[PDB]
Structure formats: structure tokens, C-alpha cells
Amino acid sequence: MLNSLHAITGKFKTQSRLVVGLGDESVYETSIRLLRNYGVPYIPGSAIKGVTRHLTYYVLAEFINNDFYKRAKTVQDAFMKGDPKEILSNAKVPERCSRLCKEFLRIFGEKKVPEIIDELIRIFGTQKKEGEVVFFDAIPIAEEIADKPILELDIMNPHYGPYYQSGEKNVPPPGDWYDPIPIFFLTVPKDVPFLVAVGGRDRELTEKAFSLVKLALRDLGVGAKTSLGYGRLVEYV
């Protein structure tokens, strides 16, 4: 059949090293990774969706007006937990835009604010609505891997917290810490090729989604330690 979905794809290489946590691998996941991809894990589409979500809450925080971190938390909670349409009703395009904001507005052309909220509702979904775009897993392109990638194995623990916080902070913040669960992480070298894709019935909606994903992989990153610059991917040939 094929899904009858429009699949927008591109080829991406790791611009900086990519740090990926190994979960509980199914036999399938282990099969592909060991036998096809020289041990290189994939990037879950849910992670691609998350970072792309995050990008849009960050930009849209510039569209309402207190402290920035509070606004971002508002936009994020609205899209993910509540009704974004209702809460961001009075959003207006800002006087001064960030670069990410500029890039965002280039994707969504001459569409007005309450309209773009709708396209984003459709792309990602909400608590009441199904998302109309599939965020596929980003997968190593085995044949285009020149030499056998040298992989590093390290152990780290997770610490969870709100991304947006008052004042400067360090992490984990005082009184808080990592959880007592050791996790394997593989570090993937630069210039490892991944296939990246999104799908949906609406071709133009799906294309916009792809553009956001591009934007998010170049400037925000996936995997762990992204704040140190790890996990950036850029399109090639």
C-alpha cells in the first residue's frame, strides 16, 4: 500500500557529536543497530517531536506579554495540557523578534497568529485533538557510513525539572539532584548520516512540520547534553 501519507524526507549528518541513551532495546532494535549500523542507535521520533514542540513554545512566548521564563511555561503548558487556542488568543507578532522567531515566521508565510496556532494544533495535536503529522524515527543510513564509527560508552543519570526557571540556575538546582538510575549513553561521532522524515495527508502542513524539524535539529539539538552543543544535525547533498 504505503501509508498514503505524504512523506517529506531529508538526509542529515551529525554536525557535532551525538549523545544517545540506550533504552530497553527490543530484538528488532538490537538487530538493526548491531548488524546494519555499526552500533549507532537511532533518534526516536518522539524526541524529534519534543524538541520541535519546544522550539515553537519558545518562539510563541515572544508573542505574549511578564518574565520570559513564565511566558514560555505558559505557552508550553497550554499546548501540551490545556487549550492553546483559548490561552494564546491575544497573541500578537512581537516588535523585536529573535532569530528563531524570524525563522519561525518565514515557515508560516502570510498567515495570522490565531491561524498558525491552528496549524500547530494540527501538527502536534492537543489533549482533545489528534496530531495529523507523524514524526518518524530518525535512522542511521548504513550505506553512507564511510568508515566504522568509533563509539564511546558512558554512564549518566537523569535529572528532571522545568526547563524554564527564575534567575540564573545551575543544574541540578540546590536541594535537587540526579535520580539513582544509571543509564548507558553512546556518543556518536560527527558526520554520521541519518534519515529524517515526517508524514501526513496535508502535504503543505507536513512540509511546514519538516521545516520546523530542520530548524530544531540545527539550532537546539537532540539527544543528551545539547546545552553543551551536542546533538546538532544539518541537511546535506
Tell me which residue range forms the domain holding 2: 1-237
Experimental technique, in short, is: X-ray
The CA-atom distances, in angstroms, between 136 and each of 98, 168, 195, 209 are 28, 35, 10, 12
Going by C-beta distance under 8 Å and a sequence separation of 6 or more, which residues neighbour residue 161? 171, 172, 173, 176
Number of domains in the chain: 1
Report yes or no: 123 and 159 within 8 Å, Cβ to Cβ: no
Q: For the stretch 176-192, what's the b/e string if a residue is b when 16 or more beta carbons lie within 10 angstroms of its beta carbon?
A: eeeeeeeeebbbbeeeb
Going by C-beta distance under 8 Å and a sequence separation of 6 or more, which residues neighbour residue 83? 126, 127, 128
Helices 45-61 and 99-107 cross at an angle (nearest 10°) of 110
Written as nine digits, the cell of 42 is: 537511532
CA 171 to chain centre: 21
Going by C-beta distance under 8 Å and a sequence separation of 6 or more, which residues neighbour residue 145? 37, 38, 40, 192, 193
Helices 203-219 and 113-124 cross at an angle (nearest 10°) of 90
Residue with cell 526516536: 44
